[PDB]
């Protein structure tokens with residue numbers, strides 16, 4: 413868990429302008445969070461990037477999990493292998509508001525983080541999931557009580573998020 417160059421926002425929430433994949437390779441965290449969908453199809457964005465860094469081993473393991481257990485719910489999660497990126501991957505489904513899912517489920521999505529002491533994570537429901545990223549950071553700070561290191565791969569968004577937190 414050798415996180416470097418993060419800015420501490422609260423006693424348990426840290427943030428960095430970084431690619432989560434590159435952070436996972438450098439840090440070797442105990443848990444890396446995936447911004448998953450309910451059938452664990454890692455077809456693009458953050459999930460596609462984490463899967464590609466495992467050379468597709470994450471997708472094969474995810475398909476086997478879904479075959480035995482069925483899909484996740486929106487706001488839910490499952491723990492699978494971290495492969496070469498972490499000890500464990502926590503696959504968390506935040507709401508996709510561009511697809512009509514309720515933004516209120518973002519609190520349930522972050523609540524999954526509280527079962528793990530230390531996590532490297534992306535900003536849930538941001539990007540093409542359509543949630544307002546400043547609102548996602550607020551829900552994270554209000555909901556997560558364990559130690560979370562957020563990697564946001566965009567300096568423009570990073571700067572807006574830090575400015576919003578420090579108002």
Ligand SMILES: CNC(=O)Cn1cc(-c2cc3c(N[C@H](c4ccc5c(c4)S(=O)(=O)CCC5)C(C)C)ncnc3[nH]2)cn1
Pocket residue numbers: 430431432433447456457458459461534535536537538539540541563564565566569
């Ligand atoms: C040349 N191809 C590539 O760059 C592929 N490639 C993408 C990455 C990569 C993207 C990324 C990231 N993006 C942020 C984000 C946060 C949450 C969600 C999304 C996006 S989404 O995937 O659109 C939908 C699910 C929720 C946005 C807001 C800057 N945040 C951290 N680490 C990240 N790593 C590496 N590689």
